[PDB]
Amino acid sequence: PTFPPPAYPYTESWQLTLTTVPSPFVGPADVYHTRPLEDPCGVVALISDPQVDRLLNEAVAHRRPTYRAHVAWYRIADGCAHLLYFIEYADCDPRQVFGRCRRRTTPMWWTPSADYMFPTEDELGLLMVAPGRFNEGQYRRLVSVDGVNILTDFMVALPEGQECPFARVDQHRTYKFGACWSDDSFKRGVDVMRFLTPFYQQPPHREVVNYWYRKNGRTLPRAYAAATPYAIDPAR
Numbered sequence: 001p002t003f004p005p006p007a008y009p010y011t012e013s014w015q016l017t018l019t020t021v022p023s024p025f026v027g028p029a030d031v032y033h034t035r036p037l038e039d040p041c042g043v044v045a046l047i048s049d050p051q052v053d054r055l056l057n058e059a060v061a062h063r064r065p066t067y068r069a070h071v072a073w074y075r076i077a078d079g080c081a082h083l084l085y086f087i088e089y090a091d092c093d094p095r096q097v098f099g100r101c102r103r104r105t106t107p108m109w110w111t112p113s114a115d116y117m118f119p120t121e122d123e124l125g126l127l128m129v130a131p132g133r134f135n136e137g138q139y140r141r142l143v144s145v146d147g148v149n150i151l152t153d154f155m156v157a158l159p160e161g162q163e164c165p166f167a168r169v170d171q172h173r174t175y176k177f178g179a180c181w182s183d184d185s186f187k188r189g190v191d192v193m194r195f196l197t198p199f200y201q202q203p204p205h206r207e208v209v210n211y212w213y214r215k216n217g218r219t220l221p222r223a224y225a226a227a228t229p230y231a232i233d234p235a236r
Helices: 053-061 170-175 183-188 202-215
Strands: 011-013 030-033 043-046 067-077 080-092 101-105 117-119 126-129 137-145 148-156
Touching: 043 148, 053 067, 053 137, 117 202, 126 202
Parallel strands: 011 101, 030 148
Antiparallel strands: 043 126, 067 080, 067 137, 080 101, 117 126, 137 148
C-alpha cells in the first residue's frame, strides 16, 4: 500500500464561474461497458481514462501557469438527461495530477445517488456500491479543461433477478432520478444549486459510504478494473 500524499491548501466555495449545469449533449461520446459484478453486493466501477493529461500538457506547452476545469455526470434517457454530479476547479496546476487546484467547489450531487455512489480517488471516475437494479442504464461523464470537453458513456448492465439484499432502494422509491433535461433546457440554463446538493469532497464521501458497506459486512476492493469498449457477458 501507500501513505496518503501531502496536503495542499485550497479555497472551497459553493460555486466558481458556472451557475448552470453544462450540457452533456455538446458532442459524441465513446462508449464503455462497466465490468459485471462477481456478486450483487460488489462495486460497479465507472472508470475509463479520459486522457485529460493531453489538455494539461497543452497548458504547459503554451506556458499557461494554471488551467480551469469541471466534471459532471448524468444519467442519459431518451432525448434528455438526469443530473447526477457537478464540480468546478480553478487555478489548477498543469504540472500536478488532475484536480490539484487552489480553488474548487463542493461537489454537487443528486443526494439519493450519493448514498452509495462516490468519485474515484483521481476524481475522474465513479464507484457505485451494491447497486439496486434500478441503477441500470447509461451514465455520461463530462470532463472539461480550459473549455475543451471530453465525453464518455458508461453502460451499466445489471442482470435481471440479481440484487444486493442491502442495496439502497428507499430514497429511489421517493425521489427517483429527478427531472430529465433536454439539450435546449441545458442551453437556456439548468441551475446547479436548484437541483443538486452540496456534498463532501471525495475522501470523506468515500468513507461515509464505506462505513455503511462495512457495517453490512463488505470490504471495498483494493483496486478497480476499468470499463471496456466491449461488453463482458452481455444479455438479451
